[PDB]
Structure formats: structure tokens, C-alpha cells
Amino acid sequence: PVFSFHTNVSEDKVTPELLKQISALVARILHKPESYVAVHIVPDQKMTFAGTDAPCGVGVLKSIGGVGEAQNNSHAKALFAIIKDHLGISGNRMYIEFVDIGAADIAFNGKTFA
Template sequence: MPHFRIETNVPKSKIPQDFVSKAIPVLAKALGKPEQYCVVSLIAEVPMNFGGSTDPCAIGNLMSIGALGVEQNKKHAKVLFELVERELGVPQDRMYITFQDEPTGNVGFKGTTFHSLFG
């Protein structure tokens, strides 16, 4: 159920082919969630300007059912910013990440919601 979505102006040619595969275990470990429920998506070559510059930049959104909060998000931010900087070349001061904690009833899976499956 965790989904880390990244939009960036970095060209596809500069993104490692295995980026999303490498990001899954990082995300799962940070959130303490099973890898089989984690999703990482990356949208490259988005026309994007951050602070008046089109140098490499990104915007991210991390959605999860639980495992998010003021103190937890600081730890998640550290790991995810480091990952994006190392793998995509986006400096940590040229990206934002929003954290979205969703209730189980707001996330669908297998024709129902997580609330129905695990609630």
C-alpha cells in the first residue's frame, strides 16, 4: 500500500534502468512494510522549474497507511532524499516530498479496501 511517486525534469537517459527496483527495498525498510505491497513510480522529463531554475529538480509524494507522522517523516525524508540525490542526481534542496497518511478505508485493493481486508 505504500506508494512513493516522483516527478522530475531529469531526462530518462540519465535515470538508472533499475531505479524503481532499487527503491522498493529502501521504501519497505523505511516504513516497516512488506516489499510486496510497496509501489515506486517515476515520471521523468516533466517540464519543471524549481525556484526559477530548470536545473534537476523533483517533487515526490509518499502515501502510506500508517507509518507516517512528524518524527517518522523526518527519518523517511532522510532516506528518500538521499536515494533520489544518489540515483537521479537531484540535489536535496531542489525537491519536496509530501507525506500522505491514508485511512484503510481510503485505499482500494483486490476489489475492496484495506479496511475490509485487514480492518
């Protein structure tokens, strides 16, 4: 899995602990070995939400399985909570997209997964 998140919050506010916590959370909620988990957080971005430059963010959780029409709402609760707790972004100013990737459509160690 890959969790990516882009935000206009300052880099200083983005800590090693945040990425390590997200990493562990994503492994748990998707039931994936953490050796497969990538986390990518991009601060200091030029963004607006609702037409204003107040703190906001947009991100994606991509995985082969684990994401799914009936699991994603739970995933969203957990991920919005950790981001709000560390970064302070309001829930009405952030999105997370969930992408279920076919195994033939993502590669790792020089090969696709199918």
C-alpha cells in the first residue's frame, strides 16, 4: 500500500513520528505486512479548499485489495483522526481517495504483482 497526502501545513509541523504512526496504522487496517507500506507526506503546498488558503489537504490510499466499498468508511475514520490529531486539519477541508489497484497494474522489486 501507498498513503500519500499533500497539504499547505508547514513542514516543521510534519514529524518522523507522524509517518511512522501512519505506516503502522495502514498495515493494521489493510491487514498488510508493513514491509509493503509506503507513506508520503508533502507539506508547504500551494492549495485552496472552499476557495480559501486556510489549512487543508488531499491524499490517496492505494492498495491491492484491503480497500473496498464496505471497508473504506472505517479506513477514513482512522486516517482522518490521525491527520487531525497531528496536523490539526479540519475534516471538512480534506479528502482521501481510496484506490483498489489490480495486481497486474502495480510493480515492486522489478515485477508486477500479476
